[PDB]
């Protein structure tokens, strides 16, 4: 009919919105848990070097 | 932000639809409506002819 | 009817699942930030400790 499409149009934006956002905030995770891994790898890296220094 | 004018925007939009859409809703209500005693007083017409028309055929 | 209503449905079934992954990613993005903080500060330190042996 006439609001029906409306309200279905309404539906999707809601859709199209909040799939976006969802996987944006899966991209953000996966760039900081690679970030965070990456500095604790450096840090085992230091303590390797702090081990060779301390021999 | 953006999304939030648009979600006003989008929003507003559905409000004034489903308005419009219950509105000729009623508008096409009342049209059958005023079709349904149309076709009441049709039958009334069928009757009535009917009738008029059995007594003539009678005589 | 029938369509209207498994169509608003399954549509409002996708926005659910799409804001509640997201929480989830978003939470879990805030999680590692925070142990990504703590693992530069405990570094830094690591670092000075590992200078002054050296010296």
């Known amino acids: 009919m006439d609001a029906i499409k409306k309200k279905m149009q309404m539906l999707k934006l809601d859709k199209e919105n909040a799939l976006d956002r969802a996987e944006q905030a899966e991209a953000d995770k996966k760039a900081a848990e690679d970030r ?3 500095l604790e790898d450096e840090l085992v890296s230091l303590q390797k070097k702090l081990k ?3 021999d | 932000d953006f999304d939030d004018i648009h979600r006003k925007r989008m929003e507003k939009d559905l409000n004034e639809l489903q308005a419009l859409i219950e509105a000729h809703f009623e508008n096409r209500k009342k049209e059958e ?6 076709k009441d007083r049709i039958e009334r017409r069928r ?3 009917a009738e008029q028309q059995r007594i003539r055929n009678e005589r």
């Open chain 1, 36 to 38: 965070s891994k990456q």
């Open chain 1, 52 to 54: 060779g220094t301390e």
């Open chain 2, 33 to 38: 409506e005023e079709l349904v005693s149309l």
């Open chain 2, 47 to 49: 009757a009535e002819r």
